[PDB]
Design a protein around this ligand. Structure first.
Ligand SMILES: [Zn+2]
Ligand SMILES: [Zn+2]
Lengths: 116, 98, 287, 214, 56, 56, 10, 217, 49
DNA sequence: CATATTTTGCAAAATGACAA
RNA sequence: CCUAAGAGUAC
DNA sequence: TTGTCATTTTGCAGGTACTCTTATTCAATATG
């Protein structure tokens, strides 16, 4: 969705119909700041959310001692050592697919097979 | 358990002074946009600010507690995934030696 | 071989069993059952060790089920009869612009899911666009109902200073810190609602504290000495209104502290809970 | 037309259940009518346009010789099907006046969706005429053929008197059956009437119970 | 337990006692068996109370 | 006796290997969820059944 | 419920 | 099942599909709201084929420029006997002509449903601003209120193979297998009337429903 | 091999009453609970004085 | 100096409208 | 003597 | 001249026996 704020009073901008050009127009509700629309999308509702499963990855995620290590192939460094963890989305119906972070390149690669 | 003890509680002011000295940003002038990947520092459940280099801060806090400058009953937890740093000095915490 | 660690009350050996309780000043988020309208509740049992030592429970509740559309987040402030919307609280603390409020709540610009889930709150609070207006709103919801309109602002200020998140501070000028903490609580609530983290386990032993003889005797003595000092003040007022002479010995009543401590330790009850103090078992050394 | 086919199939099942209900009540309905096939029903009660007609689907039944001997107080019965999904006051009034002027002691109204409460209040007409309303959805499956549902036989007044006399019972000491139970509605029980229940017990082969309508 | 890595679904990590009572239980297996026995005792107490009430 | 203990250890090892193979299938998402339950529930059901029949 | 665990209801 | 089709596995599958409740919430991957200035062309290149089929096959001047787009799940349409035509017909029937709905074909790479609320001839100078909100409300009710197939209070149906004792024509009681449906949730009155099953032999854990549907005995 | 700490001894997870049990790891756990509750009722010398 | 008084589990019943 | 509380036995 | 639908308040009780010990009975100001 990528919500955007007014640059005059730092307030929300809502979508608005236009007649002269028949275009989406973002408007302020308190200072009448009006501008164009970057995208026609104004509302996204993720019934099945794919993002958030790799959330929590940090530039020094390897410093965590509780995270298990692995020697699986890294398809950017060909390095053995890396850390791995399951999906971070805590929904009960998520799959048990694993994610790997290389400690020398910080590239996240999965163990999935349908995607590959 | 045989080796389990209960903390008696200490004054958190020295730890707050250590945090301020070592580079803890005060919470009053913290703007999340300019410091997105900042580790929030909690002392006894009070969010006191953010730190931009949590690894060095945790290392020096561990060194201070391991030489006795910080009371050993004080518990320091670094949650990397959540990007949080919690320090507890209150009484009633049950710990064991390792 | 006797190890000590027990009292002798009236010739009987009494031991104070370590009383377990939930830790204070920790934010805990819990899901709610289907019949309830609120789906998730984030609460903190705020308490200050070096003050009045009173428990004030702040709750942040997310109204509406998963299929509901009006998902408004409301906070239960102490001494307020209604659940105030969160954005009203942010504006009362001194953060008027919506962008700054959302920055205080959501720390990631790309986290558009949290922004979408949080838009109903700003939509609800659009009616109030000023700090004084929000303070008046809170005062109007104030349960005292004995304050004139222009002093409702002061009443709300007192609520937000000495009653809202006491564990942070009791002084003034720290509105930003309390606003940041409220944003953090709402952030935790929204993370739990977005199925990004599980609800907090109430049985996690790291969230529990054991009150030993120290804290128990401390709170009992605090109450008992408050009683004694109130008695001292009452005696002083009585002897100054009657213009009689003032004496220290006639003022203090050591029987208060002595009898209170002896009663709390002699009987199980801990007041003026049960079974806090028990007769020490002497059947066997291991016992 | 699949919706039309399922609707006419449900209507045919309802018609079969209604005929079974009337025959079980003691009236003279031949076995052939009960087992009427789908094609014959569609030829008779459905027009060329494919829309079944209910006006000519309503019918009249009469008690058989055995029922007359056992129940020498009950006469002809009328079963009506409504066409419009919602039954108004005017249609119910026409039905009840038609029942009254034809001297029917019982009249079954079979409706599609619902009856207006303004028509429910006028359902109780002048005695001894009684009006029973049934929903076609509830009449799709004959509950009495379920193995959990045992055999129900209405008792005559003489039989009820004999039952109370032999067992030294009062009216209230019999087991009760509500005057809203699906089987009681199926058989048209009135309050005070006793049904004998034949059951396949497992300790003895056959067990007979009795339930009084309340 | 803090003796296992994160996201370990192996039988030993989630409470499979591969040792007999004759051989003896490892500390983790001992703790897991203690958890199972605690569940059994709690169930026994709850069951006897509930059955008493139902019987009355 | 010795041979019986060796056979028991072999059986336990074989069951643990089957559990490891099921875990590899689940972690590769190749496992299919049983109708009426999620992926994780099916995986847990299979693991528990394997361990139970191993003990038996 | 019950009580405990009136009814519902009453 | 009906005795003549007790072991017929595909008939059991047919009945399982017939009774199991399915909602759009279990099928729609995601939903979106877009601003298309004209209801004749779209700004999304992916679904332009859908519009250039539907408009070519076929009035449109009274359609709101706001559009609601639903992306469905291929697996949901696979494991259950559901297709784009069926769900489109269900939406059209439950919303009458108030909502213009188009859908991609089943063989298409992405399952897309595009909806536009029709514009009444009465001009409104304020409903245009809240049109997006109205569409949101319509999407909300379209997620749960409408049912694709199956009767209500049926969370999930599973199929099992039972083995009963049937008297053989020669005299003995032989073991004969049947397919049996176990259903989460109880809608006994509505399930019992479904054709293809044996109405006599239906049974329920909830004896309250049995009592209120079948009788006190 | 990424350990940060080491247990001083696993047998220190037990309490005072359970530390008396010989070979507690060869027992069914309810038996250990029974002995823990029952050794407090054991008879001996509680104090030397 | 001594006795007297200041955690848990919901379906409804009730309410405020209401609409012509 | 009453009341309250605590500990415990067998289920 | 009749249905409608949609928020706000409504009551609670927890198994059977049995053993032992400990504390406590309103404090204190006020008038006869
Ligand atoms: Zn603006
Ligand atoms: Zn790499």
């Amino acid at each position: 969705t990528t919500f955007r704020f007014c640059r005059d009073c730092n307030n929300m901008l809502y979508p608005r119909e236009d007649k002269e050009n028949n275009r989406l127009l973002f408007e302020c509700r308190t200072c009448s700041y009006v501008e164009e629309a970057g995208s026609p999308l104004v509302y996204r509702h993720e019934l099945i959310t794919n993002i958030g499963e790799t959330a929590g990855v940090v530039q020094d995620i390897g410093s965590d001692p509780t995270l298990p290590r692995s020697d699986r192939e890294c398809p950017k460094c060909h390095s053995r050592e890396n850390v791995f963890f399951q999906s971070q989305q805590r929904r009960k119906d998520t799959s048990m697919v694993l994610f790997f972070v290389c400690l020398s390149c910080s590239h996240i690669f999965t163990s999935d097979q349908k995607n590959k | 358990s045989l080796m389990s003890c209960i903390s008696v509680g200490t004054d958190p002011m020295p730890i707050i002074t250590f945090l301020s000295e070592w580079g803890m940003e005060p919470l009053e002038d913290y703007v999340p946009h300019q410091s997105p990947d900042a580790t929030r520092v909690f002392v006894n459940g009070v969010w006191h600010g953010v730190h931009r280099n949590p690894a060095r801060l945790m290392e020096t806090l561990r060194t201070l507690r391991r030489k006795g400058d910080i009371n050993p009953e004080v518990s320091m937890i670094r949650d990397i995934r959540e990007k949080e740093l919690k320090i507890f000095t209150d009484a009633g915490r049950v710990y064991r030696p390792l | 071989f006797d190890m000590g660690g027990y009292f002798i009350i009236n010739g009987s050996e009494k031991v104070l069993i370590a009383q377990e309780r939930s830790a204070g000043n920790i934010v805990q988020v819990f899901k709610k059952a289907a019949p309830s309208p609120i789906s998730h509740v984030a609460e903190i049992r705020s308490a200050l060790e070096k003050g009045s030592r009173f428990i004030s429970t702040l709750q942040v509740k997310l109204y509406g089920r998963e299929g509901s559309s009006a998902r408004t987040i409301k906070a239960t402030l102490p001494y307020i009869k209604q659940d105030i919307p969160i954005v009203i609280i942010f504006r009362a603390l001194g953060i008027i612009p919506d962008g700054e409020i959302l920055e205080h709540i959501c720390y990631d610009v790309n986290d558009w899911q949290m922004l979408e889930m949080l838009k109903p709150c700003v939509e609800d609070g659009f009616v109030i666009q000023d700090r004084e207006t929000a303070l008046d709103f809170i005062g109007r919801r104030g349960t005292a109902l004995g304050i004139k309109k222009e002093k409702r602002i002061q009443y709300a200020k007192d609520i937000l200073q000495k009653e809202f998140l006491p564990h942070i501070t009791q002084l003034e000028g720290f509105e930003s810190r309390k606003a940041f903490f409220l944003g953090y609580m709402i952030n935790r609530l929204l993370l739990c609602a977005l199925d990004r983290k599980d609800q907090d386990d109430r049985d996690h032993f790291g969230k529990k504290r054991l009150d030993l003889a120290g804290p128990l005797l401390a709170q009992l003595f605090k109450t008992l000495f408050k009683k004694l000092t109130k008695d001292i003040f009452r005696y002083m007022q009585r002897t100054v209104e009657e213009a009689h002479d003032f004496n220290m010995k006639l003022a203090i009543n050591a029987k208060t502290i002595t009898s209170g401590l002896k009663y709390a330790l002699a009987t199980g009850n801990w007041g003026e809970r049960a079974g806090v103090s028990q007769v020490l078992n002497r059947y066997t050394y291991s016992s | 037309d699949q919706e039309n086919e399922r609707n006419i199939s449900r209507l045919w099942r309802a018609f079969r259940t209604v005929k079974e209900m009337v025959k079980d009540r003691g009236y003279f309905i031949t076995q052939e009518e009960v087992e009427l096939p789908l094609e014959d029903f569609k030829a008779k009660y459905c027009d060329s346009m494919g829309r079944p007609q209910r006006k000519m689907m309503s019918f009249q039944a009469n008690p058989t010789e055995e029922s007359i001997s056992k129940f020498p107080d009950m006469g002809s019965l009328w079963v009506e099907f409504c066409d419009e999904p919602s039954v108004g006051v005017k249609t119910m009034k026409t039905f009840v006046i038609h029942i009254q002027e034809k001297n029917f002691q019982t009249g079954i109204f079979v409706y599609q969706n619902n009856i207006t409460p303004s028509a429910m209040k006028l359902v109780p007409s002048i005695p001894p005429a009684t009006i029973e309303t049934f929903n076609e959805a509830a009449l799709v499956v004959n509950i009495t053929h379920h193995e959990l549902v045992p055999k129900h036989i209405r008792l005559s007044s003489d039989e009820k008197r004999e039952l109370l006399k032999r067992y030294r019972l009062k009216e209230s000491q019999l087991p009760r059956i509500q005057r809203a139970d699906p089987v009681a509605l199926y058989l048209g029980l009135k309050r005070g009437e006793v049904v004998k229940i034949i059951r396949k017990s497992e300790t003895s082969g056959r067990y007979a119970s009795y339930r009084i309508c309340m | 337990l803090p003796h296992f890595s994160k996201d370990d679904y192996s039988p030993e990590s989630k409470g499979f006692v591969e040792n007999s009572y004759l051989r003896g239980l490892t500390p983790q297996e001992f703790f897991f068996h203690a958890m199972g026995g605690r569940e059994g005792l709690i169930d026994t107490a709850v069951k006897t109370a509930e059955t008493g009430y139902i019987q009355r | 006796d010795g041979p019986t203990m060796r056979e028991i250890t072999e059986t336990i090892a074989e069951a643990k290997k089957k559990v490891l193979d099921v875990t590899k299938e689940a972690q590769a998402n190749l496992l299919t969820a049983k109708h009426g339950m999620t992926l994780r529930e099916s995986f847990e059901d299979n693991v528990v059944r394997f361990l139970n029949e191993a003990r038996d | 419920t019950x009580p405990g665990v009136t009814x519902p209801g009453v | 099942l009906e005795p003549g089709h007790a072991a017929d596995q595909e008939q059991a599958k047919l009945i399982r599909s017939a009774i199991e409740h399915t909602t759009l919430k279990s099928v729609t991957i995601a939903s979106e709201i877009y601003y298309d200035p004209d209801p004749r062309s779209t700004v999304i290149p992916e679904d332009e084929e859908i519009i250039q089929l539907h408009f070519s096959l076929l009035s449109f001047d009274q359609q709101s420029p706001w559009l609601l787009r639903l992306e469905l799940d291929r697996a949901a349409m696979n494991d259950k006997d559901l297709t784009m035509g069926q769900v489109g017909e269900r939406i059209k029937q439950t919303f009458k002509n108030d909502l213009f709905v188009i859908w991609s074909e089943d063989n298409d790479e992405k399952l897309i449903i595009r909806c536009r609320v029709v514009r009444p001839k009465s001009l409104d100078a304020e409903t245009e601003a809240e049109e997006d909100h109205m569409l949101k409300k319509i999407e909300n009710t379209m997620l749960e209120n409408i049912t694709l197939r199956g009767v209500e209070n049926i969370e999930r149906v599973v199929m099992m193979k039972y083995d009963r004792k049937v008297p053989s024509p020669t005299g003995e009681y032989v073991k004969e297998p049947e397919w049996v449906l176990e259903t989460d949730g109880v809608n006994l009155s509505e399930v019992m009337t479904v054709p293809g099953i044996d109405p006599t032999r239906i049974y329920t854990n909830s004896f309250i429903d049995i009592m209120e549907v079948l009788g006190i005995e | 091999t990424t350990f940060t700490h080491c247990e001083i001894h696993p047998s220190m997870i037990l309490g005072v009453a359970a530390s008396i049990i010989p070979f507690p790891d060869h027992n069914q756990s309810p038996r250990n609970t029974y002995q823990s509750a029952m050794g407090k009722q054991a008879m001996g010398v509680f104090l030397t004085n």
